[PDB]
Amino acid sequence: MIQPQTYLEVADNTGARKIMCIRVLKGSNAKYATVGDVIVASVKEAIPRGAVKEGDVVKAVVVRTKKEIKRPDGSAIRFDDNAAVIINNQLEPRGTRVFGPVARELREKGFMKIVSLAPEVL
């Protein structure tokens, strides 16, 4: 459950540390982004000399949510933070690696690069 104003950890090494969602890219008025959804966000904190800098307006895909995610098999999964991987206009990761686990929901939505780069797919 990500929405505008929501801060996300960025789980890549593009250099961004925290971004703030400013739109969820799912039609004209989606209220919330969940795992596998794309957002537009502002970069609020970033480490020096990264590929991205503070103030940049980026796109990202949500790879972890603190609101639990429900699966058709009746199970669910939930993480300690809300996290995203910053992407380009082709839904490809702008970083070389991704940190921490990511949700398997990513696979079916066409984020294979990210899924393979992740240390664990849960």
Partner: protein
């Protein structure tokens, strides 16, 4: 009519009897059927059970682990056909039913607050002696 027994009847066909008993606080390994592309495989999820929500067949439980630096919680239906098996890897003794509080605890504090449950461990060793 007995509406409850009717529901119990419908549920009876889907009930599991092969899974071991555990309590909130135990450390458990859950072998889960997982789908990747066109194949199925087994993926193990091991962590502390922090909650068992009882409603007969509709019982579910929650397992928490730290994964590559990130807290993760999975909620499993106790009778899901997707669970290959559950392995008891350790018995912990808690003094309450819901262990939400461990979410805010260091690893050291968790280990301190959740002491090894020596009674239920000894019991385990008493079984696994087959005649």
């Amino acid at each position: 009519m007995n509406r409850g027994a009717l529901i119990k009847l419908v549920e009876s066909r889907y009930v599991r009897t092969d899974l071991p008993e555990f309590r909130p606080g135990d450390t458990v390994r859950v072998s889960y059927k997982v789908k990747e592309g066109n194949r199925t495989r087994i993926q193990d999820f091991e962590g502390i059970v922090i909650r068992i929500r009882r409603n007969g067949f509709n019982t579910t439980f929650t397992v928490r682990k730290v994964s590559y630096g990130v807290g993760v919680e999975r909620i499993f239906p106790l009778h899901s056909p997707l669970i290959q098996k559950i392995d008891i890897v350790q018995r912990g003794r808690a003094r309450r039913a819901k262990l939400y509080f461990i979410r805010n605890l260091s690893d050291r504090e968790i280990r301190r607050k959740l002491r090894a449950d020596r009674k239920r461990i000894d019991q385990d060793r008493a079984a696994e002696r087959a005649a």
